[PDB]
């Protein structure tokens, strides 16, 4: 059954659509005749339009508000099948050329939405008396229902398809459903068809790039939620639309909004914060530099030759995560903070300066720089630092701007425990505390691979021994809330799905 969402385009992309999961936006010849059931609205804007097979209007959108049947200014528009517009209201308005329509009532075709049922210009329905209204009410709606209330897999009417995942009390665990069925439109499919990618709600949609990301964890592409920023390459300074550009220009800063892996070389150069005259770029508002903070890789050479002075750390690249120098500025430098005014270099996560060497010079007020051990940062043996001319090391130590002693000897890119390459003790996420909440601590976490792992929150902290050994409430030692078999859980399963979607009482 073909599907769709200029007149020629819509007539070719709507002609054979046996069902359209989008909207029936027929605006402005007899190209539609077998549009069976539509999960959405119908923007009818035209005098002879068959539309005969239009059976169910779901109003999943509305023109302005509950406007499922928007009409205007079609006596031979025999919507005889248009018998039940569900979850919507009929805006059957501006019917000047419509005949045989006033005689037929306009209310039995909608249910419990007569409040928004406005219409203005037993009884036959459409053009030609051969058609009748065929009242059936005064779960089928189109008259083993022909059109189901919510989901009709093959012939049955079901409110909801068989889930892709069905709990296994045999595993004492909420498992997948062997009869797993994605709900394509209104029919359940074992395999998500139409090159459609499984979506969060399960209704495979052909586009879930919003607030999510596509994944392929099986033979079918799936849309996964966007972890932080999800991947979104953007051409960088030097390559692509900015190929001639000389910096992150202000007329260039915005287009990198939510740019994940800037593919060129970000090179924020002094003219930029100065703003340039010959290139016509207004001054980049110093707060706007926060845009690039979503950066998570910079496949080029980042020569950041000034940042706003009122900020004491290069906080704007506080997510730079690999600085692979596919090109290297002067072929020798990969991370090149040169003559800034930053207190600590502070690039809090850069843990693979892949290609070039790193020169961090001129930083007259950068102190935590020297203690960093750049060998673990360099990725190839030809990398060699030149971290020079910084703030005086002896003066730094005298002034006390030395790393938190809760930091391992490898150094630290900034004074706060956030900026420390590795810790003397283990770490609780970004920072690195003295001690995990092994017995005392509200988070009551668990140490894992020199890292504090906050417990499954559904687990009570324990005051005699360690609270929870490992991740997952299965690993939780204390669960004052209910515990599900050998696992702890929020609450017991009752409205669960079973062999035939049976509500598993489980235990009390």
């Amino acid at each position, epitope marked *: 059954k073909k599907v769709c969402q200029h007149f020629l385009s819509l007539q070719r992309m709507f002609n054979n659509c046996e069902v359209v999961l989008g909207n029936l936006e027929i605006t402005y010849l007899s190209f539609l005749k077998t549009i069976q059931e539509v999960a959405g609205y119908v923007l009818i804007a035209l005098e002879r339009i068959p539309l005969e097979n239009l059976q169910i209007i779901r109003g999943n959108m509305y023109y302005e508000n509950s406007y499922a049947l928007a009409v205007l200014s079609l006596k031979e528009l025999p919507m005889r099948n248009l018998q039940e517009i569900l979850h919507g209201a009929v805006r059957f308005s501006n019917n000047p050329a419509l005949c045989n329509v006033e005689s037929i009532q306009w209310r039995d075709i909608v249910s419990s939405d007569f409040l928004s049922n406005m219409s203005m210009d037993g009884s036959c329905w459409g053009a030609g008396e051969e058609n009748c209204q065929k009242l059936t009410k005064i779960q089928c709606a189109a008259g083993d229902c022909l059109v189901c209330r919510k989901f009709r897999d093959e012939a049955t009417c079901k409110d909801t398809c068989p889930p892709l995942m069905l709990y296994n009390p045999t595993t004492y665990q909420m498992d997948v459903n062997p009869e797993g069925k994605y709900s394509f439109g209104a029919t359940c499919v074992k395999k998500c068809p139409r090159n459609y990618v499984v979506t969060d709600h399960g209704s495979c949609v052909r586009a879930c790039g919003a607030d999510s990301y596509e994944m392929e964890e099986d033979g079918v592409r799936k849309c996964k939620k966007c972890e932080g920023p999800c991947r979104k390459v953007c051409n960088g300074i030097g390559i692509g639309e900015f190929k001639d550009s*000389l910096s992150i220009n202000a007329t260039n800063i915005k287009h990198f909004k939510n740019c994940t892996s800037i593919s060129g070389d970000l090179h924020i*150069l002094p003219v930029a914060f100065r*703003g*340039d*005259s*010959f290139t*016509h770029t207004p001054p980049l508002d110093p707060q706007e530099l926060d845009i690039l903070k979503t950066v998570k890789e910079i496949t080029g050479f980042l020569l950041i030759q000034a940042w706003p002075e009122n900020r004491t750390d290069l906080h704007a690249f506080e997510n730079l995560e690999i600085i692979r120098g596919r090109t290297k500025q002067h072929g020798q430098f990969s991370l090149a903070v040169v003559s800034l005014n930053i207190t600590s270099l502070g690039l809090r996560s850069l843990k693979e300066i892949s290609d070039g060497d790193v020169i961090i010079s001129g930083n007259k007020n950068l102190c935590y720089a020297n203690t960093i051990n750049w060998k673990k940062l360099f990725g190839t043996s030809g990398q060699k630092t030149k971290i020079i001319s910084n703030r005086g090391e002896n003066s730094c130590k005298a002034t006390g701007q030395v790393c938190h002693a809760l930091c391992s000897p490898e150094g630290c890119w900034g004074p706060e425990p956030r900026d420390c390459v590795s810790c003397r003790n283990v770490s609780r996420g970004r920072e690195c505390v003295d001690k995990c909440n092994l017995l005392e601590g509200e988070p009551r976490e668990f140490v894992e691979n020199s890292e504090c792992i906050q417990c499954h929150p559904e687990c009570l902290p324990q005051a005699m021994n360690i609270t929870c050994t490992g991740r997952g409430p299965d690993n939780c030692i204390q669960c004052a809330h209910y515990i599900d078999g050998p696992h702890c859980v929020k609450t017991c399963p009752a409205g669960v799905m079973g062999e035939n979607n049976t509500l598993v009482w489980k235990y009390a």
Partner: single-chain antibody
Amino acid sequence: GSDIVMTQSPLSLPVTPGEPASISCRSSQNIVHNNGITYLEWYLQKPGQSPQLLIYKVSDRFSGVPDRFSGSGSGTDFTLKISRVEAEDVGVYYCFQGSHIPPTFGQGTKVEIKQVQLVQSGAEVKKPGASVKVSCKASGYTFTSYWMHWVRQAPGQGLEWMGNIWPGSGGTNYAEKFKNRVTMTRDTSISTAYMELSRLRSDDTAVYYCARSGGPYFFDYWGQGTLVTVSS
């Protein structure tokens, strides 16, 4: 399209001191850039002196430019007001355009009566078809941090932007009128910018004032200027 004609209404208007001078120039098209800033100026060159900028944009003022100068304009018509005129104001005020890709200096109203320093090189005379490399030494600013665009001022004709070079990377953005004759290189090492104009022609005789292209004001601070008269 080749040159947003910057006609200026008065020409060589001579003015008695202490008078409300007003010099209008009209741009052959709308000088209204996609950024929306009307990147206009009116840079002054005192007799026998380098061009210096006067009104930072259409009506702001350059730091150090006395408020005695003012100006106004919109669309394609713009004009500058000199409420009080002294000996200092005497000279030619030249209206440069900005939204159009090629900077293009207008006719020029010669007003009459009715630190970082970039050193240019010294006066040279070459012969037709030859080449002159007029140098531009730079100090007081990071030479590879302000594009050293190099205007040219024909005798008996107005300024015309010739090309730029972001001393950092050796980029050149040559102008069309000289597009196959000029070559702008730089030695960031020695903090001097060279510009070798090869195949010199009879009308090429001009003083290559080598200014430093600015942030919100184009052609900020200028060099002495290296005149090169070439005759046949």
